[PDB]
Structures are given as structure tokens and as C-alpha cells.
Amino acid sequence: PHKFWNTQPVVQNDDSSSEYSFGPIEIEPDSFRKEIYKLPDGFSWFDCNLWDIESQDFEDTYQLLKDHYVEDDDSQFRFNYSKEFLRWALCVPGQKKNWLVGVRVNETKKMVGFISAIPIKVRIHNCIMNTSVVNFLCVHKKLRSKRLAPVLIKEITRRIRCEKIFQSIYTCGKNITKPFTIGTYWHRIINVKKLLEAGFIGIPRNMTMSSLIKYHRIPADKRIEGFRPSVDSDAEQICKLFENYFMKYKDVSNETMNNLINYDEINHSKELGKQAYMKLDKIEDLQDKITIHQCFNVEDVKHYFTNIDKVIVTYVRENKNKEITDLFSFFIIESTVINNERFPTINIAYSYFNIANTCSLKELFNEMLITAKNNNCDAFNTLDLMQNLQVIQDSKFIIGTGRLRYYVFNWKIPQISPSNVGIILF
Template identity: 40%
Template sequence: KHKFWETQPVGQFKDVGDTSLPEGPIEPTTPLSEVKQEPYNLPSLYEWTTCDIDDEDTCTEIYNLLTNNYVEDDENMFRFNYSKEFLRWALRPPGYFKSWHIGVRVKVSKKLVAFITGVPAKIRVRDEVVNMAEINFLCVHKKLRSKRLAPVMIKEITRRVHLENIWQAAYTAGVVLPTPISTCQYWHRSLNPKKLIDVGFSRLGARMTISRTIKLYKLPESTVTPGFRKMELRDVPAVTRLIRNYLSQFVVAPDFDENDVEHWLLPTENVVDSYLVESPETHEVTDFCSFYTLPSSILGNQNYSTLKAAYSYYNVSTQTPLLQLMNDALIVAKRKDYDVFNALDIMQNASFLKELKFGPGDGQLHYYLYNYRIRHTLKPSELGLVLL
């Protein structure tokens, strides 16, 4: 059934529930000299390209490929529309490798027709911190689908990750592959219910009118938590301590240092928003919340072309109830004109979703590890990792 994935060092469906298999690497690390030195062969019309994301023209080509060919919902009404600034942020964290930003071009025309990326990350699984690659933005042009290009791209990025002496990876997908470490549910909180209904993102509930719906989702103009403010550069040490301590409770989570926190959590306009609570008395940073900006193109609507969505990122509550903290995040997102606030049921998110009027979506997100076995499937609440 999975001709490619059956050949890879990933958990296989036949092994699900086999408690005799040990946790950890599935195949041993091989000497670097045994890693294939030449790229894998592509069909003869195509060639590899290493993408220079600093280059404005290359960035535009990647943006255009993804804008027209990346992930859609199951009814093909919406398509992720990552911005160029977002892509530059997502692809250049501390210690990134340019060689992991891989494109495929048509030899004759040089048109970019496929893409896959990796970025390095230290990810803790129970007590082990493992150097991994986070794989994302796998995309094959719509006209080149089902030609088995994806397996070649996955093998090539695996080779280039191995060349950096890294042997594990983490990735997420909307499709079921061998085999998820966890399956998570998307939840959605309407901020602009009229637009969401107009574009078919949501439907009017039973016995509901548009004006009752607008009233239901209404939010205050300003945040309620004293000391709630935007994160600044000077907060990096305190936020790092707060988030490291918080993430230590999850089975799988990133192992962030101050450089990672500066890159991944310091606010970047239209990319990532982060807020914290500084105690008015002690000036300690006690709580934190963040979201990233990922619009979707609305396919074939007369009146609207984009849906402005905020995605819940890392949130930490020690003094402010998580419910109140996330309500403040909703207030901020509403004030910034987002149409919807999305979240997965990972970490402690299940504790606020229903109460803050999120509803379950029709999409799921499956989490995977490459070359690392987990003995039992994890509950979403055991995951402390957000991939973009």
C-alpha cells in the first residue's frame, strides 16, 4: 500500500501495538563516509536547485509555487498562503543550512516546480534531546502530481540532512502515513463571523441568525490582564526560562535556548506575535502567549480573496489562568483584524477551546518522527511541539 514509506525507517502499521520494540532510533547512525555523495536522480526533464531564500527573485518563485500549489482543505475552498517574510523567518533559524532548501526546476525553462525544506531543531523525546531536522513545505506543482516525485525529494533531503550528521526528523501532514506519533484536531474561533460565513469557512448554526452569531463572538476592545504587553528583546532570558520550564512537562517538545527564543518568539510584524504578563509588583514575567500569521487564499469567491488567520503557537500560564490569557490573545487578534484564530488540541489547549467558543474543524494534523520509534501513540496533550 505504501510502496515508498514501507522502505523507510519509520514506525510501520504492522508494528503498531507491538510493545516489545524499543523506543529510540530505528536504524543506527552510519559513518558519514557511507552517505551517498551525489544527489538522487530526477526524471531527465528536471534538475535540483538549492534555493537562496535571501535572493528576492528566488523567494518570489517559492512564494508563487506555494501560493498556487500548496495545502488545501478537503473541499478545495482554501489554500495556505504563507507570506515571503514568513518563509524567510521559517527557513532561517539559528544554525540553518542553505543546502536544506531544495527546489526542482524544469531543465529547459528553469521554472520552479517542486520544493522541500528542512531546518535544524533540538527536540526532546522524554529524557533524550535529539538533533533533528524539521521538514516542511513539501510541494509538487499540480501538473506534476502522482509521478513519484515526492519520494525522490524526501530521499534527497534525507541525504542532505545525513551529510550534516543528523539522523532524525520531525514533520506533520494532513494525510495519514506510516505512522503518526499523534493525531491532533484543528479548532477554530470565529473573530469575523460574517465574513467566515460569506466565504464558506463556517456555517450559520441551527436556530441562529447572523446578528445573534455576531453577538455570540463579540470580544472586548482591550485586554483585561494587568501587565499584559508585547514581548521585547530584553525579555528573551526570562521568556526562555519560562518556556523551557513549561515545555519540560510534554513527551515531545523543542529544547529552546535563548537564540531559539529570540528567533522563534520575538515579535516579527505580520509573522509572529508574542505577548507576556509582567507582574506589576515584582516585574517578573509570569505568563506568555503567541500566535503566528498564516493567511489562506479563498478560492473562487467574488467578494473576498484572503482569509486572515492567526494560529496559536506557544502559550505558558503560571499566574494568569490560561483561559484569561488566551482570551486576551483573541482580543489582540481581533483588534489586529484577523478573521479567525486557529488552534490544535495539543499542550493544554483543550482546557480553553470550548469555553472560549472554538469549534472543531474538519481538518486533522498528524505528527511524525523519522527514524525514531515511540512505543505508544501519544495523546495530543502530550505534545509540546508546534510546526509551522
């Protein structure tokens, strides 16, 4: 039974009612608490200085997450985010310094808690809005099960609402409240023997070692030409590429797409904010379209769809008129292999956003797989979001352990298919 989430504007696991399928759960621009939340005696809030990669805050945050962030259910693996990755994932265009939130023990000066928000722009059906993503929530193992996490959630909620933002998106490896979709990870295994020794994959009973190796082998015999690393001067062309992609796969009419409700212009008023409520005739109306996605301006594109060693890879294809026609991208995270002396870490690539116009999506993903292999990744991960089932189906991808639950704070989204979701979190 919930003692915190029962009190919050989210869809509850037992709730189903309103005649509107989409729109804000509440419109409360004036009534939210603005006084900072108290921590237990001996603890203090701090704004975490990730603006200097050499700072002590950055070292403490890196160590905190290294030893206390997300593990798989069997506690065999734990993410080991690099400082360069954290800098890229959190020091994003428009970021606020007070949205990087730490908890420090006064007596020891040790950082024992972290929570972060980043600003993003999204479309949800017939509305657009500036919103937030909450990520990297983390409490030190010795402080778990003491109801500290709700204090962190309430505090970042306060700091986001002070910027006039009243919704947030987050994902979780667990069922908390009712998720609006569930994402399933799939693996393309690159280094079979290493990942078998690390316990990331098993070998089945009626299969020889050489059969498992051959099963997962990458043929680099079929290649397609013209892909190159993106550079900053590609940002206008990439921006238009994403615009055209989201127009192609939108779940609303051409008329609505050109008259999207801008929630930021009405969220100050209970009366006007009601304009964001929308009924859905039938769920099948959404089939195979995107219902919710991130939106990128040129500054965003320059930040995210770049190339940073061991962090993010983005390649683009050009036509002879130097139009950019295709894009693949993936980010990279190292994970600790807990208590493994032989292979103490593994390197996993994660599909980010991909746009195939002049080749098939399998062909695009094949060039990306080869590129991930060339970036010393041990496996390539893809969710079944967007159109990624076209590459998972009838392929060598194998299912991952765990499920990603997608959540929206203070908005109503009907339960939808992951193919209707274009939100990738770090």
C-alpha cells in the same frame, strides 16, 4: 499500498511489536547513501536563495506555494504564505543553505518543486537531540502523481544525514504511515460574516444570523493587565520561562530530567546508540505530561518569540521585580479563498507557545484572542496540544475541518495524546 514509505525507518500502519516504547528505529551512521538523487531528464536541483527577500528564487518559491501548496479537502482554501513569513519560518538559527531545496525545469527555468528542513532541538521522553523538521514539501499540480515526491524526500533525507542528523519530525493533513498523535484544530471565529461569506464556517439550520454573530462575539469586558510585546532584550527571561514550563510538565522523573540521554553523542555508533532505548511501564504514566517538545536556547527565543507585522506576535507579562511570568504567542498566515471575488483572502492566527503562571490559561488566551483581533485576523486557531484543552473546553471554540497527523522519522514514540506533544509547525 505504500511503494515508498514501506521502505523507510518509520512505524508502519500495521506494525506493533518491539519491547521498547521509545528509541531510534535504526542506527545507521555510516551506511546511508551520499550520492545526490537523479531527477527526471530536464529537471535540476537548486539551493533556494531565501537569504535575499528580493531574489528571483524567493519570488518563484512564493508563487509556487501560492498556487500549489496545501488546500483543504474541499479545495475552498489554499495557504498563501508571505515572503516575510517564509523568511522567518525557514531562515532560522543554525539553518544550512542546502536545506532549502528547489526543483527547476531546465527548458523554462520555472520552479516546480520545493522541500525544506530546519534544524530544531527536542526532548523525547528521556532523550534530547538535535533533529530536523521537514516542511513546505510542494510539487506543481501538473507534475503530481508521478512519484516525484519520494525523490524530494530522499534528497532532503540525504542532506540532513550529511549533517549527522538521523531523525526528523513532520506533520501532514493526511494519514501516511502510523502517526504518533493526531492534532485537532479549533477555531475562535472573530469576523463571522466575512468567514460565512468565504465558506469557512456555515450557519446551522435552527439559528438566526444575529444568534450566530452573538455566539462567536468576543467580550472585551474582562481584561487582565500587564501584557506587552516582547523585545529582543527579553530573551534570557523568556528562555528561563520555557525551561521552567518544560520542567513543570515533563513526563520523566526529576532524576532522569537531570540525566537526559544526549543522542548526538551516541548516534555515531550502533553499540552506544542503543543506550537510547527505553521501556514504558504503562501509557498512563504519561497522562497530562509533555512527552516530546521543542527546546529553545536564547538565540532561538530571540528568533521565534518576537514580533513581526503579519507574521508573529509574542506578548509577555511582568511582575513588579521585572521578572517575566507569562507569555502568549501566535503566528499569522493568509489563505486564498479560491475563486472568491468578494473576499479573495482570509487571515488566520495560529496559537504557537503559551505559558500561564499568574493567570488562568483561559484568561491568557482571552488576551491573545483580543490581540489577534487587533492584528486584523479573521479567526484564531488552536490545536488540542499541550494544555490547550483547558481553553477549548466549555468555550466558544468550534471544531475545525481536517486533522494534523504527527510523525517522527527514525524514532519510536508510542501513540500518545496530543496533550503530550509540544511541537508546533509552521
